[PDB]
Amino acid sequence: NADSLPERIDLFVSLFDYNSATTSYDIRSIQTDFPTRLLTPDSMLPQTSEYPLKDIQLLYKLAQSCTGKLPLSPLITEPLVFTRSLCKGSSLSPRWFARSGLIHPGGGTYAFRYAEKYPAQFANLLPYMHIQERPNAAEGTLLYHLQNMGEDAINALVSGASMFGSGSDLWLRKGDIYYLFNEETWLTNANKAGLSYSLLSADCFIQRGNICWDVEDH
Template structure:
């Protein structure tokens, strides 16, 4: 029987925990913390413990996952195929030199010949086609017509089975490691961190498995973390398939500094918002004051207009035209002042107040000023914010008159509880300008500022402004 003496020597040598000759303070600290971790962990209860004395009863070559597969490094595929032919037909294939031990074994099975235990212990343990000679023998001998081996013989031969055989005494304990874990623990490292969180340890005393909650508590007490190599780019100490990293500690100074920065940021943001609020309030007060002060010159202007109206017939035709313009400007200035004052004193409700109006009368008034025609699908009385909606429409009409192409038309329709008003001309806004007008505050030959105001006012009124091309159309959708 093969022993694990060479592996015991290697493991005993490796039990001196790995230390990297790095001069950094962190490396020294990690080494010290790791040694304390190992010293504390081995005193904890293990889920699985297999002593070294018991491990020595089983050859390492049969514990490795490679024992299950054909040994193509030492034997050719023709030789393995020849052994399979011999096993099935009991006739030696011609032209193929079979391994002597395997050939002897297969011929004994063909003759249903019982082999002594010493035959399995002397020479190679693994069959060239995979598995162990003992495992293949026990599987075949059950079909022999002769008296099967005794229970004592089966027990002794079970020590020469591959670990993947369910009859192997260590099958249930070591198979949870999986192929990667077995190769790592038996060939490469002392430690193996299983994907299920368990930690396996192989030293001169044997193999131990520690559950996740056990080793995590010990690692926490020693200020380290175990991280899979595939999950990190920095690895200063790696006693297995994982890296040892320093566990971050809570720094009260850092917490205080970060908390202070957060509070300072909140304070500065609050102060900025408060300053903006106060500035807006001050601007509102100044605007309210100016609006109030405008009432006096407007009242004086009203008296002047009334005086001229009394003497209207005595004025020359040119002065009569000037008086008409003066009257119109006075009425508009008065309306603007009253609306602004209502907005400043009573809020947006007054600003957005609607008045009942007959659509045809309102449209005739607007179109007559600019000498354009309109189209109305149905005439009725509506409640509209006449003043602000009129400002928006006049702005759009002036833009079309100045930058569009005739004819200019005003189209008014009712659609799904919306009043849809479209100012249309025969022009064509370039696609790039149209995109910028819709998506940003870009100005197009003087149109940008006015359109921005129209968009903002329409939005305040609860409506939408749409811009289309081919032909150019500015459409206001106002909810009724």
């Protein structure tokens, strides 16, 4: 009966009332309000695949002592400008962050680090901070849903997947808009289409018992 599976999934998608959705988000509005750099969890980690570890260490020591060895590689120019500015105490306008690569080599953003030293500029620099650096958003808002997405849900959203689950919500793409439905509606329409489903924490290539296995990429 697994041969009719694609047809049943199409029937499943067609059962939803897209005008009675919980909320809906245009993909364009999501890309305007959140650069991909500010969604992906890897932006919160030290940028070990972009800078040598010794260069990241040399930046932290420079930010601590505000004197001494400057890092070498010419890809540290902008992070050096940022670090020297905090040490010299000179100001960086919100337009400087809008111009930057946003992500600091030690993980997180320039804006969040700058707002930790100058908390009066927090609100104006919020658009340049990672979602995981911003305060807990109000329930039902786009930021709230994004902050509560695991890496797999974020990756599915960034890649524009036709559908993905995130917690207690189903995200369904119709055209260039995502429609959210609660899991009760998800399960009801899966029942009617003759479907069962599972939410994955990775891809599934080999199943043993009730365990889906996958190689991790890194």
